Every structure is written in structure tokens, then in C-alpha cells.
Ligand binder design. Sequence first.
Ligand SMILES: *[C@@H]1O[C@H](CO)[C@@H](O[C@@H]2O[C@H](CO)[C@@H](O)[C@H](O)[C@H]2NC(C)=O)[C@H](O)[C@H]1NC(C)=O
Ligand SMILES: *[C@@H]1O[C@H](CO)[C@@H](O[C@@H]2O[C@H](CO)[C@@H](O)[C@H](O)[C@H]2NC(C)=O)[C@H](O)[C@H]1NC(C)=O
Ligand SMILES: *[C@@H]1O[C@H](CO)[C@@H](O[C@@H]2O[C@H](CO)[C@@H](O)[C@H](O)[C@H]2NC(C)=O)[C@H](O)[C@H]1NC(C)=O
Ligand SMILES: *[C@@H]1O[C@H](CO)[C@@H](O)[C@H](O)[C@H]1NC(C)=O
Ligand SMILES: *[C@@H]1O[C@H](CO)[C@@H](O)[C@H](O)[C@H]1NC(C)=O
Ligand SMILES: *[C@@H]1O[C@H](CO)[C@@H](O)[C@H](O)[C@H]1NC(C)=O
Lengths: 49, 170, 287, 118, 49
Amino acid sequence: VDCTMYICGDSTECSNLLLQYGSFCTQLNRALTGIAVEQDKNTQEVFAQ
Amino acid sequence: VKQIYKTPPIKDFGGFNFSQILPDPSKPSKRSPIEDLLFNKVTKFNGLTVLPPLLTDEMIAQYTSALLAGTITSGWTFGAGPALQIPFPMQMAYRFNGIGVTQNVLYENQKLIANQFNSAIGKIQDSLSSTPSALGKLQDVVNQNAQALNTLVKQLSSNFGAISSVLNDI
Amino acid sequence: QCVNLTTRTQLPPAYTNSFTRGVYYPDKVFRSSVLHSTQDLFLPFFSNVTWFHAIRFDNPVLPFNDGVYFASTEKSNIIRGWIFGTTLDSKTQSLLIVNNATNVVIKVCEFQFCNDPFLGVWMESEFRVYSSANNCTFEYVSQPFLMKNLREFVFKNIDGYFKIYSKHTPINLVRDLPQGFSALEPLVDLPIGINITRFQTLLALHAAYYVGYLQPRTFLLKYNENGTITDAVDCALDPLSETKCTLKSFTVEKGIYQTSNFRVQPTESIVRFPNITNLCPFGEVFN
Amino acid sequence: NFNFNGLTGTGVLTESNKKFLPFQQFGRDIADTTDAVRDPQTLEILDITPCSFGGVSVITPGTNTSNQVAVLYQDVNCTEVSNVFQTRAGCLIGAEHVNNSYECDIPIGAGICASYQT
Amino acid sequence: LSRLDPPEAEVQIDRLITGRLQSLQTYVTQQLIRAAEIRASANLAATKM
Ligand SMILES: *[C@@H]1O[C@H](CO)[C@@H](O[C@@H]2O[C@H](CO)[C@@H](O)[C@H](O)[C@H]2NC(C)=O)[C@H](O)[C@H]1NC(C)=O
Ligand SMILES: *[C@@H]1O[C@H](CO)[C@@H](O[C@@H]2O[C@H](CO)[C@@H](O)[C@H](O)[C@H]2NC(C)=O)[C@H](O)[C@H]1NC(C)=O
Ligand SMILES: *[C@@H]1O[C@H](CO)[C@@H](O[C@@H]2O[C@H](CO)[C@@H](O)[C@H](O)[C@H]2NC(C)=O)[C@H](O)[C@H]1NC(C)=O
Ligand SMILES: *[C@@H]1O[C@H](CO)[C@@H](O)[C@H](O)[C@H]1NC(C)=O
Ligand SMILES: *[C@@H]1O[C@H](CO)[C@@H](O)[C@H](O)[C@H]1NC(C)=O
Ligand SMILES: *[C@@H]1O[C@H](CO)[C@@H](O)[C@H](O)[C@H]1NC(C)=O
């Protein structure tokens, strides 16, 4: 998930207001990326034997 | 271990370099060369602090070494009953028999067995030091938790719609 | 003695790469064994920056925008000074920087500037920059801006304060900035309140000048044990630099990283509504 | 309680073992909090140590046999809380300390654990 | 942002950004918990193999 697009993208004012929450959604963009990486790791642990 | 077991006073490990694995008594920090390599690579008033462990690195090493020393010369005989006097070469003979491998391999190739373990340990020390990322299982964990905590601090600067992000400013 | 030359050399701007230069240290904070990501006005790395030669000495006027970079090469008779202002048409509190035999004079006044200003030259004379001036607001004397060593400066407007920063570096190429890492620091901080828009280099009477514009870009800066910066990365200048500011490292391990986003904006606009067979009868009354 | 030319916060001044560039006025930690300041009147660098602080907990036996307990103040001086034992694990007020090792009963931290004797 | 006077828009925007961010956090948290269970399942599957 792209939290800028999700919350309100293509807007100067929405971007400036979203940034007042700091890194709160950056961490979610990161958590989802991390989950996706882990899903390939799970596949490799199960099948690449 | 039920109690901490002493590493035998005589290091009869059949020529194996257990001195690289078990803590070095000559140092102020009682760690083995494997441990020194890892420990040298794997690394407030804002209200966030870190509490000490009960069991210090040396204390963990004492429990770890007891289990380890037992594992190499006596197995679990220092636990389930009184200790058994199995010399390292017989512990190894039993070790091979226990996996379906004839004991003849230990005696006929005692010198090659001694060398392969030691060679591999040396390779491990070089692998971990030449490739620091090999220690990544702990380096990433400590860095990720440190980042989460540092982020918790950085987030104090956020105003969330307020005129100011600071409570004692407003 | 305002002799006008209006040389108008009309040289190609000769914009060439700034490479890894153009970084200075805007803050006053000590840091060490860290990288820090800062969004500020710096020259972009490897961006093309104009190296105009006065040499018939021309005096072109370039935009200030939100801050600029300046550097120069001089021989025997050394030119040290600038003309800055909102318009430079004798209506506002323009700033002159004039270096003389013992020190540098930083002065702000409503200077009634000449069409093609210079310093007459055993002292420099401001009378050949402007014929008169009045309603003055600032004067200060600081250390000379004099040091093969290129003189380098960065100029900024911070909430009405004009800041002047400097350092020098050895020259391998007369027409190009040397490789290495810049670290300019301020000498003066001026409380003027002037909307500086235009820069003109001030030439002394008897000449190679590098002028760039700073851009609001993020730089990842590497801080050493002394509190200074030894290196830098321009965030998302190119794909390796996207990866470096994403990871907060000057070294990237072999691998694939998620660093950016591909986004396309609408450029077209479409409005459709039903066919109207019933235009409203305003005309029944109106006409 | 500090105010150095407008920069505020609290802590303990000590002489710094590091120097700032002539330009730099203040120093910062990894957390971007103040680590040190330059003295605005006499140039010199002063480190700011945080004022002693930490959590407080009580070590206690079961109330069935004893009500003799001790107070633990973490990472600080014993004077900031005669039976006083100083340790980084937290200073124990209302307890003694003995050099001989024992099996652990109630853990304190950093290699030290409380126990009770008649 | 296209209907309300800027300061009023900012108040209404802050309320919605917060609500939208909370929905993303909730989803991510649920995916992290489910991911922990799926990772455990994958590790068990790998063990069975
Ligand atoms: C175990 O490995 C150590 C290395 O830590 C060996 O110590 C080396 O011994 C050789 C000759 O025996 C010396 O030339 C080196 O100077 C020693 N290195 C160090 C760092 O002291 C030790 O010999 C090995 N033990 C066995 C039984 O193989
Ligand atoms: C920062 O400046 C320090 C001055 O403290 C430099 O450290 C000195 O290095 C020279 C060169 O060997 C020695 O003669 C001095 O004894 C050192 N001073 C010390 C250790 O206090 C150092 O070179 C500089 N460091 C960086 C990273 O720029
Ligand atoms: C500001 O006041 C301080 C007073 O401590 C001065 O700092 C020192 O002053 C003493 C005696 O006045 C001198 O012996 C030292 O040499 C001074 N140290 C430094 C680093 O200057 C200081 O001179 C005063 N003035 C300024 C401009 O800082
Ligand atoms: C009335 O007639 C005028 C003159 O032609 C014309 O411009 C206008 O469109 C008409 N207004 C309406 C409401 O029909
Ligand atoms: C401990 O004290 C509780 C209440 O204070 C009491 O109910 C219990 O009987 C006591 N246990 C013993 C072993 O004395
Ligand atoms: C502890 O150390 C002190 C200081 O050396 C010594 O006098 C004392 O006998 C020791 N106490 C015990 C119980 O060993």
C-alpha cells in the first residue's frame, strides 16, 4: 500500500497534512513490504529443499 | 543444565579446537574467539531506557559452556544420572554408532575426523568476519528494534494538526 | 568614473557538471560517525552549472531564487566582490560586498547604481559601482575573502537574513570546479528584509566565474569524529543515489531495493453532460 | 535547569572530551536530542549528562515469613532515593550485600539476586 | 479541500486522515498477526517435507 495514494494523493494540501503524522504511515508501507518479502522466504523454506 | 558443569581441566577433545568455542580465561571478558567475533559486530532523558539482563554475557556463557562441554565429551550423562567417564574417543565412537555409522570410522580415520571439524571451525570464523552480514540474524534484529525506538522518539516532532508539536510549548 | 563597457559577450553559459561539489554546512550542530538526511538548498550533484567568463569584462545578472553558489579564478589583480538586490534599479536596500587591502566590507544601502558597475582601482572605489546612495541600513567589517586556490561561496536568504559563507580549494582545471568535498561556513549574517532576486558579480578595474543555483533537495551527509562533513549523496539524483537516501547508507549491498514510485498525472480534462432540447425559457420574460 | 542562549532542557554539566568546529554551537545524539552545548560566554564545550533518573521497584519476600523489603532505584546514586547497596542494577535501600555466591531467589539484575536468611 | 475554507478544511481533513490511517494500521496489524501464523504453518510444512 501506498499511504499517500490511499489517504489522498495528487494534492499539495493532502500531502502537507499527511506529513503532520510524521512517519506513522511510512512504517505501514514498510510493514507491508516486509510481509511480502517474508512470503517469498516462506515459499523458499517450504520448497527449496 | 541442572547445575553448571565444569569444562574438564584437561582439554581432551581428541585434538579438536574447543578453545575457540569455549570462553578464554585469560581475557577480562570471558568469551570465546567465536563469541568475540560476533560481539564486536552485533550492536535516554526522553523517557525511553533499556534495562539490564539478569544473566550477563559471561553467565550465559557459563550455562552454554556447561551444556556444550557435556555435549562433546559426555552427552546427557551429566544430567540424567551421575556423570559417565566416557573418554572423548569413545564418546565419538558412540556418536557415530548412534547415527548408523560404524565405529571403525573413528578409529581408522581419527586424524581426519579431528582435522575436518577444526578446518570447518576455522572456515566459520573466516566466513563470519569476512561477511559481517552473516551475523545478520542478530544485527538486523537489534537494528530494527533500535530504529523502532528511535522512530518512537522522532515522532515526538509531529503536530498532528496542532499549532506546535510540543506540549510544554503550547 | 562609471565607464560603461556593456560588453555583452553573449557566451554560451557553458554549463558543466558540479560533480560532488556544492554542499556546505548550513547548521551549527555537531554530529559524528553518522549520516544525516537534510532537505535544504544545495547545488544538485552532477547537474550542469554555468561557468561564465567575464573575459571587455562583461557583468551578466543571474537569478538568486532561494540561494546560489559562486566560485572564481583570478590572476595577479584579484577581483573580490558582489552586487546583490531585488531589482538593482536604484529603488531598494541592495547589498555590496567589497574586499580591500585589510578587510571585507559588507554594506547595505539604497545604492544609486551605474549602468555597468565596477570597483575603481591604492584602494577600491565604490563610487564606480554607484554614484550615490542613501537611507542606509547595514555596515559591518569582517575577515577578507582572500585565501591555484579557487574561492568558493554560498549565498542564502533565511527569513530576511542574508548569509555569506566561504572556503577555498586548489584548481586542476581553470574552467571547472575541482573534485573533492565542499564545506563552506558563514562569516556574516545580515538582518535586512530584502527580497533578493538578482546577482551581479562585482568586478574590479584592471576573470572566470562559476554560478549555480541551489535547489531544495535532500542530501545525505557523512559526519566524522571532528563534527565536519567529509562526504555527501544527492538523494534520488540517479538510481544509485535513490537507493542510498532510501537506505541511509553511502554503500549499497548487491541487491534490489524499493526506492521510488512511478506516477502519471492526468493532463486532459473532460466534461460531458446530456444534449439540451429544453433550453430554459428566460427569454419569455427577458425578450 | 538549563538555558544556553535560548536552548533549554535539564541535566548535569561536565567538561567535554570532544571539540566543536568553530562554527558549531550545539551537539546532538542519534536521537537528535541535545548531547552537548557550547558555552556562549566563555568558549568551551560542556557535555550534558542526564539528571539521575530511573524506575523504582521493591524486592520483597513473601509476607507469610517476612516484611523486610528493599527499594531499587535503577542506574543511579544511592543518595537520590545504613543498609545501602550500590549497583547499576538498582541501588537497594534496606538491604545488605555479601561477596559469597548463592542460588537465585529474587533477581535484581546484572549478575546480582536477593535472598533471605535468618 | 475543494469545498471548505482552508482552516476549516484542515480540521475536517485531519479527522479523516486519522480515520483512514487507523484503518490501514488495523489492516497491517491483522496481516502481521496472520502472517506470524502463516509463517509458522509454512515452517511446519517445511518440517514435514
Ligand atoms: C586452535 O586455533 C588457535 C588459533 O587461535 C591456534 O593457535 C595458533 O597456534 C599456532 C601454532 O600452534 C601459532 O603459530 C599461532 O600463533 C596461534 N594463533 C594464535 C592466535 O595464538 C591453536 O594452535 C589451535 N589449536 C589446535 C589444537 O589446533
Ligand atoms: C580531528 O582533529 C584531531 C585533533 O584532536 C585529529 O587528531 C590528531 O591526529 C594527529 C595526526 O596523527 C595526531 O598528531 C594528534 O595526536 C591527534 N589528536 C588527538 C588524538 O587528540 C584528527 O586527525 C582529526 N580527525 C578527523 C577525523 O578529521
Ligand atoms: C565573555 O566573558 C568570559 C568570562 O569568563 C570571557 O571568557 C574568558 O575570560 C577570562 C577573563 O575574562 C579570560 O582569561 C579567558 O581567556 C576568556 N576565555 C575565552 C575563551 O575567551 C570572555 O573573554 C568574554 N568575552 C567574549 C567576547 O567571549
Ligand atoms: C434575447 O435576445 C438577445 C438579442 O439577440 C439575445 O442576445 C439573447 O440571447 C436573448 N435572451 C434570451 C434569454 O433568450
Ligand atoms: C500466609 O498468609 C495468609 C494471609 O496473610 C494466610 O491465609 C496463610 O494461611 C498464610 N500461610 C502460611 C503458610 O502461613
Ligand atoms: C567481603 O570482602 C570484604 C573486603 O575484602 C572482606 O573483608 C569480607 O571478609 C568479605 N566478606 C565475605 C562474607 O566474604
